[PDB]
Design a protein around this ligand. Sequence first.
Ligand SMILES: *Cc1[nH]c(Cc2[nH]c(Cc3[nH]c(Cc4[nH]cc(CCC(=O)O)c4CC(=O)O)c(CCC(=O)O)c3CC(=O)O)c(CCC(=O)O)c2CC(=O)O)c(CCC(=O)O)c1CC(=O)O
Length: 340
Amino acid sequence: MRVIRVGTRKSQLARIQTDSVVATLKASYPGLQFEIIAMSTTGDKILDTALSKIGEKSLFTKELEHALEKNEVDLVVHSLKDLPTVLPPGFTIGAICKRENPHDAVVFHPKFVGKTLETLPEKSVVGTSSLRRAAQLQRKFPHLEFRSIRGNLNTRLRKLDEQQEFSAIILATAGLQRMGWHNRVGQILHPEECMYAVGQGALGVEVRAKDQDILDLVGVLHDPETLLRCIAERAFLRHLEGGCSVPVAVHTAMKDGQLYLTGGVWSLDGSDSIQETMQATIHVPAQHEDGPEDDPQLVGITARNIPRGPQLAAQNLGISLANLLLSKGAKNILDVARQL
Ligand SMILES: *Cc1[nH]c(Cc2[nH]c(Cc3[nH]c(Cc4[nH]cc(CCC(=O)O)c4CC(=O)O)c(CCC(=O)O)c3CC(=O)O)c(CCC(=O)O)c2CC(=O)O)c(CCC(=O)O)c1CC(=O)O
């Protein structure tokens, strides 16, 4: 029997998400043996030099995709928001795991315990390096300043606690939840304050597009409600053709046999914004189906064990909302942001 090799990063949140995925696979396949591979480049000193230019530092995701290509590993676990809408040739998102809290949360300086962003003092600095968050939060909170914070969860948390510069930092709720920093969440931001990124709170499993054996096994992890919402969001963002890091946010819901999708676009400052909401009658399919291998992936996702009709409706909904936003001049806001 083939040991299933899982490619991870020696990082803390990377390994936690990987372990969680593996625990689910292990419950589905009691016997199945799993090997975990982690390459840190024999130390953080070779990774520290790569920090000479951080941010959209998805060289690690390319390394993982190079290992998959070599057949060094069999599956890799990622945050669905770190996976682009167009995956390279020979790779696909084999599973869309059940969604964790998709909302953006606020952490406050130990002085501002119990105080929401609304109740913070005026001209308080708020640390975030997300143009999506800053654009929304600047528009909503004109009296708060939004400066850039740099580093990982523990670095950003440490900086806020130690230094007097920042009064609050913006971070993902699911992120804090996984690390077991749920107690530092001060405010969970709603769509009116800050809509979330595409596929935030959901884990994606990347695998080789032509590895039926690995797609079969990992198919068990697909959650249909998350998958459908995540297709809609990915389809909307892909169709917008934003480039890469732009102020694009979404909100999705599935209640009463309807998929609601809210999509928005903002200028870096937030002054100009095109937020719109559309909905489709899409029923979350409880039953798994035996679909064919010839069906192309949708927005990088292969979910042939889940009914295809409902997936196509989700893509359509996202495309419809992208199309309306473009008509309302969403193309213009994006290019201004790309140039800063
Ligand atoms: C061209 C193209 N590339 C990508 C990849 C890509 N995605 C983002 C989103 C992102 N990721 C992070 C860091 C982060 N990742 C996971 C978590 C925890 C929560 C979770 O698991 O969901 C975090 C931390 C956190 O969310 O708190 C951030 C940085 C947040 C911050 O600065 O405070 C973001 C931005 C955001 O959410 O607003 C990025 C941007 C990373 C950056 O630092 O600029 C990238 C890198 C890149 O541009 O290459 C995508 C997919 C985007 C998507 O679907 O959301 C695309 C777009 C496309 O191909 O259509």
